[PDB]
Structure 1
């Protein structure tokens, strides 16, 4: 079986970058809409006996992109692909991972069930909002981390990184920032709201680096940055793997004191970058390409958790 990479319509540039890193052309697929807006999918080449990877991020018109992904998986499965892998850099509905007191769906579990029944044998994703989502599946799920690329960016872009501070915006994700601070051998200052915020960790005259899994409306990072600037930090950075930037996010970032808002390209960023000068993108296509290549070859994927390829 050979690797076949197919792109959904959500993130074409990322799929092309992945395909170039693998020395492959993107598989021929027609992904459009019928007149009544139903998804139309046509696999333009035989996938019989091949190892198929479908790249689609949970961004943009999320329900359309998710339907397209499921329809593509189904088409490849009934076309006798030997294995079908969904490469989902940003997992849709990941924030609906529990009920907790409300008569609400667990939408992430529903998405996992739909991916399974569509025929996915394997999932590759990056920085799941909650790693318990891996347990929503019965098929293997490789949850990659942007952390090696983030560490590389910090070392090559922040001159005072040895004295900086790594700040979690909410108490929930402070595990990520502790791992990053341990890797950099720095202090991890913490922030949480009580309309007021409380911060532990000396930030005065230092650089503070907010790290989080995603920025949707940027309410979380803007409040944290306001707090940090209250406590005398010389500069504040925000680093996120998923740059969703919906709603009022671009205006809030423009009016905030961030030196830089760095995101990975798990979601296309060109349109947002046009309207916001302080957004910078870390390419993670090498990590995804290496994960695809290693799953195909039976090589260790977890080696990527700590190594930039």
Structure 2
């Protein structure tokens, strides 16, 4: 059983980078739309008794990409692939992980069920919005962390990183920032809204680094950055693993005080970089490639939680 890497249409550059790091050519697949907008998928090579990895992120036209992924999984499964793994760098509907006093769907659970019923045997993803989403599956889920790469970027790009403060934009992300604050041996601050925001932790004359899983409309991080500049911070950075940047995010970032907005490339960023000078990208394709290769060879994946490969 050999590795076969197939790309969905969502993020073809990432799939190519992963394939090069694996020393493979991207599997031959045709993924387009019929005239009536139904997703047309044709696997261009035999996947029999192979270990198939399908790379597709929850970005762009999310429902189209999700249906493409499900259809590709189904095609590979009924084509007698030995094992089918969904490599989903940004998990779609991850923020709909609970109901919370609303007659709402748990869309993340529905997506997990659909992936399972399509025939996925394994999920590889990066920085799930809530790690409880792992429990939405009955198949194994490897939730990788961009932190090795975020810490690397911070050390090699922020000269004052030893005196910086890692800041959570909200009470929800505090855990994450504390983890980073522990690995850098720096202070960590929290910010919560009461339209006013309250900040705990000295940030005067120090570089502040907001950290988060995802920036969609960037209202949260822009308000946090305004508050950080109010409290005497020298420069404010924002580091996010998922740069969705939908709606007015680009205009708000352009009007914000960020020195840089660093995001990983779980979502393609070339178009946003054109219209926003201060967006920067951290490659995490090495982490994804190493996770694929370790799942294939039966080596430890959790080794990657703390080690940059």
Deviation at 1:19, TM superposition (A): 0.4
Residues of 2 paired with 1:139 and 1:220: CA distance?
34
Residues of 2 paired with 1:14 and 1:174: CA distance?
29
Deviation at 1:109, TM superposition (A): 0.2
SS at 1:27 equivalent: coil
Deviation at 1:221, TM superposition (A): 0.2
Residues of 1 paired with 2:146 and 2:169: CA distance?
17
SS at 1:224 equivalent: helix
Question: In the alignment, what sits opposite 1:45?
Answer: 45
Deviation at 1:3, TM superposition (A): 0.4
Question: In the alignment, what sits opposite 2:59?
Answer: 59
Deviation at 1:81, TM superposition (A): 0.2
SS at 1:123 equivalent: strand
Residues of 2 paired with 1:207 and 1:190: CA distance?
15
Deviation at 1:303, TM superposition (A): 0.3
Deviation at 1:224, TM superposition (A): 0.4
Give unmatched runs, 5+ long, in structure 1.
none
Deviation at 1:58, TM superposition (A): 0.1
Residues of 1 paired with 2:211 and 2:307: CA distance?
19
Residues of 2 paired with 1:206 and 1:173: CA distance?
21
**CA distances 1:14-43 after superposition (whole Å, capped 9, x unpaired):** 000000000000000000001100000000
Residues of 2 paired with 1:29 and 1:39: CA distance?
13
Deviation at 1:166, TM superposition (A): 0.1
Deviating beyond 3 angstroms after TM superposition, the runs of 4 or more aligned structure 1 residues are none
Deviation at 1:192, TM superposition (A): 0.7
Deviation at 1:66, TM superposition (A): 0.1
Residues of 1 paired with 2:131 and 2:173: CA distance?
11
Give unmatched runs, 5+ long, in structure 2.
none
Residues of 2 paired with 1:31 and 1:268: CA distance?
18
Asked if 1:138 is matched to 2:145, the reply is no
Deviation at 1:135, TM superposition (A): 0.1
Residues of 2 paired with 1:80 and 1:69: CA distance?
17
How many residues end up aligned between the 2 structures? 309
Residues of 2 paired with 1:214 and 1:34: CA distance?
33
Deviation at 1:259, TM superposition (A): 0.2
Residues of 1 paired with 2:286 and 2:108: CA distance?
27
**CA distances 1:64-123 after superposition (whole Å, capped 9, x unpaired):** 000000000000000000000000000000000000100000000000000000000000
**CA distances 1:256-299 after superposition (whole Å, capped 9, x unpaired):** 00000000000000000000000000000000000000000000
Residues of 2 paired with 1:149 and 1:192: CA distance?
27
TM-score scaled by length of structure 1:
1.00
TM-score scaled by length of structure 2:
1.00
Residues of 1 paired with 2:48 and 2:103: CA distance?
44
Q: Aligned-residue CA RMSD in angstroms?
A: 0.3
Deviation at 1:6, TM superposition (A): 0.2
